[PDB]
Ligand binder design. Structure first.
Ligand SMILES: Cc1cc2nc3c(=O)[nH]c(=O)nc-3n(C[C@H](O)[C@H](O)[C@H](O)COP(=O)(O)OP(=O)(O)OC[C@H]3O[C@@H](n4cnc5c(N)ncnc54)[C@H](O)[C@@H]3O)c2cc1C
Length: 398
């Protein structure tokens, strides 16, 4: 059995890639190992994500599913008492990922992507060229594809399989995130009751509060890996650590709150995988690159890469050799992702200066677009340059 495109995984990257490939008239199979709906962390969307969601015809459905509108994000430093607000670029939402991912997958089915509940386990190769995959599903099946798209997220299938490059981890910023859902959290005053709230103390010590339904808020406490394994060891203790040590806002807001279900812990390690394109295959989303979620780029970038990949895939299915089209995708992805990574690094090194710089109308407006996810067409902007130069200056002097 043959498809133009086989996609591993139906998170936001895989779903959007499938939809876009269908719009280009390609045949598409998506293999997803989990039954939807399924829990997934990563709840606060960018302005650009909202635009894609609107373009998919889902705006009214987002509201009806009870996903709060997101007016922007408040960043509060507990140690310095510096706080700044970044208004949203365009209308968007805070989501419960189980329901959200289900709604998007449904759109991909409406677009005619064929789905299988199954686990991809291997690739099929013709020399160095990838030409299909094996998946389980109580039998091992074989499928043939002109392009195998890895949208496996954090599972990073093609990297683990040795087809894509090795995972390059950013060791200096390794964190562990611990989170749970609560009811009864005290929200800010309308019209900003459903802003995302970020509270931070020391470098790489921070917490989020994200409203995800009419009465439910997502709480995360994120701390360096070493601190976690020394003082906490489990998510309940890490959250309590943040309550006690990151910000008095937490105790205040959570005074009458009640936890819903159990807490979980998860690695928050930045990484990139290179190469992430090759003959007959490519990675999109977290399957090749993960940024610090303090600025919530993940879902937005996953969707953007799925969309841009479809353009490359269409060129190869139409007859082109893989290199020019895939290297164009690669270069475009690296461009945007590096700007986002620089913004995050710049913030962590100079969080107060970052705040003071928002008082500058020109920078402020660029940062609004950048935090909105518009990092992929920035030739001639001032901010990306400032970030890059600062980071290089900081590094060269250490
Ligand atoms: C602590 C934390 C907080 C975060 N907060 C935010 C936030 O506020 N906003 C935001 O935008 N992002 C956030 N993120 C990031 C966000 O969750 C990811 O960037 C996003 O899920 C990436 O989408 P994806 O499609 O690439 O992968 P995923 O969404 O993970 O989807 C991948 C899919 O592939 C399937 N799969 C995996 N392996 C296989 C296989 N072998 N065969 C078949 N199927 C497979 C999985 O079941 C899964 O459904 C956060 C992440 C973390 C860790």
């Amino acid at each position: 059995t043959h498809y133009d495109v086989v996609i591993i995984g139906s998170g936001p990257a895989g779903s959007l890639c499938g939809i876009e490939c269908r719009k280009k008239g390609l045949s598409v199979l998506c293999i997803e190992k989990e039954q939807f709906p399924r829990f997934h962390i990563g709840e606060s969307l960018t302005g650009n994500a909202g635009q894609i969601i609107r373009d998919l015809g889902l705006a009214e459905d987002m509201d009806a599913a009870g996903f709060p509108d997101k007016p922007g994000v408040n960043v509060i430093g507990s140690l310095s008492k510096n706080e700044f607000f970044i208004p949203i670029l365009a209308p968007t939402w805070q989501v419960r990922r189980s329901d959200f991912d289900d709604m998007i997958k449904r759109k991909a089915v409406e677009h005619g992507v064929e789905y299988k509940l199954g686990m991809v386990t291997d690739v099929i190769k013709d020399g160095e060229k990838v030409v299909g995959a094996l998946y389980k599903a109580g039998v091992e099946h074989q499928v043939r594809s002109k392009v195998l798209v890895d949208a496996s997220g954090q599972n990073t299938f093609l990297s683990r399989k040795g087809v894509a490059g090795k995972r390059q981890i950013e060791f200096f910023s390794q964190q562990i995130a611990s989170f749970a859902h609560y009811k009864g959290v005290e929200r800010d005053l309308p019209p900003f009751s459903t802003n995302t709230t970020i509270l931070y103390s020391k470098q790489y010590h921070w917490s989020w509060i994200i409203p995800i339904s009419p009465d439910t808020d997502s709480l995360g406490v994120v701390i360096p890996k070493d601190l976690y394994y020394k003082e906490c060891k489990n998510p309940d203790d890490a959250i309590a650590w943040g309550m006690d040590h990151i910000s008095p806002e937490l105790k205040r807001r959570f005074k009458n709150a009640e936890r819903q279900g159990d807490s979980q812990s998860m690695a928050d390690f930045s990484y990139r995988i290179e190469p992430f394109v090759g003959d007959g295959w490519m990675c999109i989303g977290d399957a090749h690159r993960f940024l610090d979620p303090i600025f919530s780029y993940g879902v937005s970038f996953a969707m953007k890469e799925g969309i841009r990949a479809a353009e490359a895939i269409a060129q190869v299915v139409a007859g082109q050799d893989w290199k020019a089209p895939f290297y164009a995708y690669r270069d475009w992805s690296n461009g945007g992702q590096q700007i986002a990574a620089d913004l995050i690094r710049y913030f962590w090194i100079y969080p107060i200066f970052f705040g003071y710089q928002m008082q500058n109308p020109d920078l402020r407006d660029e940062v609004i677009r950048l935090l909105g996810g518009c990092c992929f067409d920035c030739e001639g902007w001032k901010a990306p340059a400032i970030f890059r130069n600062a980071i290089e200056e900081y590094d060269r002097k250490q």
